[PDB]
């Protein structure tokens, strides 16, 4: 959607192309221009090898999704950031269940029949020492040899009390202390495989700056495998989280269902831009075009043409993982 191969007589299609086109007719310059595609049709092209093809002057200008990093500003010149972007962390949402099954969960279904069964068979032992007739034993078992039955039966209930607590704690802690991420610092230390997109600076920014092993970062080709690397989770060869720029991620939420949510804020907020030939005087020409293209609101009107996909779908909104005992557990 942002920039793409096309069969049309311009040759390319997208959003950044039509931002680039709508800046040309603001300039007083009749500019002849061509469009040369760069990479293969199998994966993304390496954008450090796109900007390398502007330093070596094979292309006078790289128009696309080129992101301002502090080597890329050093070797070429950029325009002003016409759109804002930041690396986020997308991850699966919290599916916290709620049921009366979640109530009776800390014992096995056979254990709820053995325990309820060995209160009546022990309750039938009271009849040996002793519908409306059967309720007479409950008036006698409120608080010889039958007292010795009550002593052992006391220490049974002082264990089924003292184990049902220990298996409702051991669910309500492991539900909290499972493999979780709520920030980029959670994702650095918890040594799970991280997905990225192929051909980006995000591969060589996490390695260079965030100190992440190269074996954790897993490349990924297209937007169908951006789901199959999260439906499988951290196991089965998939990855825990995908780290992409913000305008890529606001496409992925709408394109999929409401099962993912950006668990953090942007931890590197830079923006996009056009990559020119270094110290070319067109950069001062189109920086004045874009800052006049933005203030007239045309930079927003083009955004509704292609990137109209935006649905919030507040599954979870920075939810506090705390006590939160389930409403249907006491239904």
């Amino acid at each position: 959607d942002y920039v793409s191969k096309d069969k049309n007589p311009p040759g390319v299609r997208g959003y950044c192309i039509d931002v680039f086109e709508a800046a040309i007719e603001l300039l007083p310059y009749p500019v002849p221009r061509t469009y040369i595609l760069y990479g293969d049709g199998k994966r993304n092209p390496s954008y450090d090898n796109l900007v390398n093809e502007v330093v070596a002057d094979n292309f006078d200008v790289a128009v696309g999704d080129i992101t301002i990093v502090t080597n890329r500003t050093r070797y070429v010149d950029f325009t002003q950031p016409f759109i804002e972007s930041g690396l986020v962390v997308v991850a699966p949402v919290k599916e916290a269940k709620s049921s009366p099954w979640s109530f009776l969960k800390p014992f096995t279904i056979e254990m709820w029949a053995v325990t309820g069964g060995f209160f009546l068979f022990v309750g039938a032992m009271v009849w040996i020492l002793e519908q409306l007739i059967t309720i007479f034993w409950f008036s006698f078992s409120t608080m010889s040899l039958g007292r010795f039955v009550l002593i052992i039966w006391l220490f049974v209930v002082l264990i089924i009390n003292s184990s049902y607590t220990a298996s409702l704690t051991s669910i309500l802690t492991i539900r909290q202390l499972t493999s979780r991420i709520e920030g980029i610092d959670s994702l650095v230390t918890s040594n799970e495989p991280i997905g990225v997109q192929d051909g980006t600076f995000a591969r060589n920014y996490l390695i260079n700056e965030l100190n992440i092993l190269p074996s954790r970062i897993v490349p990924l080709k297209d937007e169908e495998q951006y789901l199959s690397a999260l439906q499988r989770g951290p196991n089965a060869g998939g990855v825990a989280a995908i780290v992409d720029e913000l305008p890529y991620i606001e496409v992925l939420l709408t394109n999929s269902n409401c099962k993912f949510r950006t668990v953090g804020q942007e931890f590197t907020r830079t923006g996009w831009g056009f990559a020119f030939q270094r110290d070319s005087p067109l950069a001062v020409d189109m920086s004045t075009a874009i800052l006049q293209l933005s203030e007239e609101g045309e930079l927003e009107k083009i955004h509704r043409k292609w990137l109209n996909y935006k649905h919030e779908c507040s599954m979870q909104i920075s939810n506090s993982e705390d006590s939160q005992l389930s409403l249907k557990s006491f239904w």
Binding site: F118, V122, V149
Partner: peptide, 27 residues
């Protein structure tokens, strides 16, 4: 294992009750 103590203690009191029934027959 905890239900084994439910079995040993309750079956002990059947024998004390049956010895009481055997002494009930002694009257």
């Amino acid at each position: 294992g905890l239900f084994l103590i439910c079995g040993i203690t309750c079956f002990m009191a059947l024998t004390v009750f049956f010895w009481r029934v055997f002494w009930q027959y002694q009257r």
